[PDB]
């Protein structure tokens, strides 16, 4: 398992599954991504050992982003947003976690807030799956 002096990795293979030491107190995850036509959805999960704190799901089949989470392994209430992505275009997607709110930006502009339902301090894994190519992934605490 390799680490980086800049906490950044290029061209990781999907599905990407990357350990992280919590995701709170101002942690930022920056992804440069290209949604693909290989699947009609892709998602990013910020997972603790027990639950998903945030599941961010881009859905080209439904024309939406769906955010949700699990508690005791069951899905909670969905937040639905417009889909800010187009397949085969490049996006910089950032998540920023502080004070129980995970703020989400696309190409530098605020896209949505997610009010977490389980503490993001317990996050231990960043998972990226589905119809998406990850060009780069970076975490700053």
Ligand X SMILES: C[C@@H]1O[C@@H](O)[C@@H](O)[C@H](O)[C@@H]1O[C@@H]1O[C@H](CO)[C@H](O)[C@H](O)[C@H]1O
Binding site for a second copy (CB under 8 A): 1-9, 12, 18-24, 27-29, 126, 139-141
Which of Mg ion, a second copy, ligand X, none does residue 11 bind (CB under 5 to 8 Å by kind)?
Answer: none
> Can you tell me which of 7, 10, 75, 107 binds ligand X, judged by CB under 6 A?
75
Which of Mg ion, a second copy, ligand X, none does residue 57 bind (CB under 5 to 8 Å by kind)?
Answer: ligand X
DSSP secondary structure string, 59-95?
ETTTTEEEEE-EETTEE-PPEEE-----TT--EEEEE
Site size toward ligand X, by CB under 6 A: 7
DSSP secondary structure string, 12-36?
PPSSEEEE-S---TTEEEEEEEEE-
Our CB check for ligand X shows the closer of 14 and 139 to be 14
- Report the nearest approach of ligand X to the CB of residue 105 (Å): 21
- In order of 14, 77, 116, 130, the CA distances from 21 in angstroms are 21, 26, 17, 24
């Amino acid at each position: 398992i390799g680490i980086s002096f800049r906490n950044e990795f290029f061209n990781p293979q999907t599905p990407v599954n990357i350990p992280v030491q919590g995701f709170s107190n101002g942690a930022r995850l920056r992804l440069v991504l290209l949604p693909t036509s290989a699947d009609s959805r892709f998602h990013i999960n910020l997972r603790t050992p027990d639950d998903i704190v945030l599941h961010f799901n881009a859905r080209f089949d439904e024309g939406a982003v769906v955010n949700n989470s699990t508690s005791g392994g069951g899905w909670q209430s969905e937040d639905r947003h417009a889909n800010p992505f187009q397949q085969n275009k490049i996006y910089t997607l950032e998540f920023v976690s502080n004070g129980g709110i995970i703020s989400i930006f696309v190409n530098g502009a605020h896209f949505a807030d997610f009010v977490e339902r389980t503490p993001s301090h317990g996050v231990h894994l960043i998972e990226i799956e589905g119809g998406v190519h990850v060009h780069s992934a970076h975490v700053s605490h």
